[PDB]
Structure formats: C-alpha cells, structure tokens
Amino acid sequence: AKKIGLFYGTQTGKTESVAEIIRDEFGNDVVTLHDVSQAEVTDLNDYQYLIIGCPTLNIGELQSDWEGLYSELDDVDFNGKLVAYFGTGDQIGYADNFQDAIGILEEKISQRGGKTVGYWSTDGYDFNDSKALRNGKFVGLALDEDNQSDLTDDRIKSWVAQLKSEFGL
Numbered sequence: 765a766k767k768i769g770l771f772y773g774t775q776t777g778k779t780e781s782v783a784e785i786i787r788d789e790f791g792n793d794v795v796t797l798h799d800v801s802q803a804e805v806t807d808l809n810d811y812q813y814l815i816i817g818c819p820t821l822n823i824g825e826l827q828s829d830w831e832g833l834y835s836e837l838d839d840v841d842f843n844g845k846l847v848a849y850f851g852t853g854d855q856i857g858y859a860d861n862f863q864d865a866i867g868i869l870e871e872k873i874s875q876r877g878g879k880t881v882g883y884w885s886t887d888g889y890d891f892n893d894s895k896a897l898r899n900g901k902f903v904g905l906a907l908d909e910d911n912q913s914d915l916t917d918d919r920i921k922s923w924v925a926q927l928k929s930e931f932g933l
C-alpha cells in the first residue's frame with residue numbers, strides 16, 4: 765500500500781474535498797484516501813503513517829461512519845504508527861464544540877497506541893471550547909469551510925510541510 769493512509773468520513777463532502785487537497789500536497793503517490801463508510805478497522809493496519817479526517821456534527825458528535833468504527837478501534841494496535849488529524853467544523857455556529865471530533869478520535873487512537881503528530885496553532889480561529897485542545901494547540905489541522913474557506917488551501921500547504929517533517933517523509 766502507499767505510504768500514508770488517510771481515513772475520512774463525510775456528509776456534505778467538505779472533509780473529502782480537504783482530504784483530496786491534502787493528498788495533492790503530499791503528492792498523489794504518497795497518500796491513499798479511504799472513505800470510512802467503505803472501510804474496515806483492519807485497513808488501518810496497512811499503513812505506518814495515518815491521517816484521520818472527520819467533521820464534527822450534530823453538536824459535538826462524530827460523523828456516523830467514524831462513530832461506527834470508533835466502537836471497533838479496540839481491535840487495532842496502533843503502536844509503532846504516527847497519526848495526524850484534520851477536522852472540518854464551523855467555529856461561529858458551534859463555538860462550544862469546535863472540532864470536537866478530532867479530539868475524540870485522537871484520545872481513543874492514542875490510547876490504542878497511535879502517536880500523535882501535527883499539532884496546530886489556534887491563532888486565526890474564534891471559538892469558545894473544543895475537545896481538540898492539547899496545551900493550547902489543536903490536536904490537528906482545523907479547517908472551517910463554512911466561514912474560512914479562503915484559508916483552507918494555504919493551511920493545508922503549511923500543515924503538510926509540517927507533517928513531512930514530523931513523519932520523516
């Protein structure tokens with residue numbers, strides 16, 4: 765399999781659009797996209813580097829497909845793997861639950877052995893609370909296509925450059 769496995773869930777396609785851009789930034793040959801509606805938890809075993817994408821929905825909840833796989837994460841050993849996270853959200857409409865989903869996923873995957881890389885600054889965002897906070901930084905890249913779609917491309921560019929360094933790729 766390719767070097768990096770990017771597993772994402774999506775309802776209206778924004779998380780998928782972001783996933784495609786992330787793939788392009790790394791290079792089409794480095795990343796393989798996996799929509800978790802079609803994935804099995806065991807597919808995560810095929811990669812030494814993982815990128816987890818998920819929108820926060822219905823006020824602080826995981827996207828449905830990730831919700832389903834979450835329950836089976838206990839069946840996977842992430843030890844030895846480096847994992848990064850990106851989330852889509854709306855900081856204005858859900859200021860108290862901005863990017864909660866990636867925080868929820870990282871908490872579980874880290875417990876299962878996955879080492880987190882890709883922490884992201886909170887500068888440039890206006891929100892009140894988030895389960896994705898770790899020492900003042902988001903556990904991963906935060907995109908907001910509802911209010912800051914004009915910032916997404918450059919944010920991904922910067923984040924991918926960071927991940928190449930942290931992944932050692």
Ligand SMILES: Cc1cc2nc3c(=O)[nH]c(=O)nc-3n(C[C@H](O)[C@H](O)[C@H](O)COP(=O)(O)O)c2cc1C
Nearest residue numbers: 775776777778779819822823824852853854862863
């Ligand atoms: C009913 C509903 C609830 C939402 N709840 C949250 C939330 O709690 N936190 C957040 O950051 N974004 C929230 N959002 C915003 C979505 O995460 C955002 O629009 C995202 O880009 C959608 O991605 P998708 O197109 O991949 O589904 C919500 C959107 C809808 C329509």
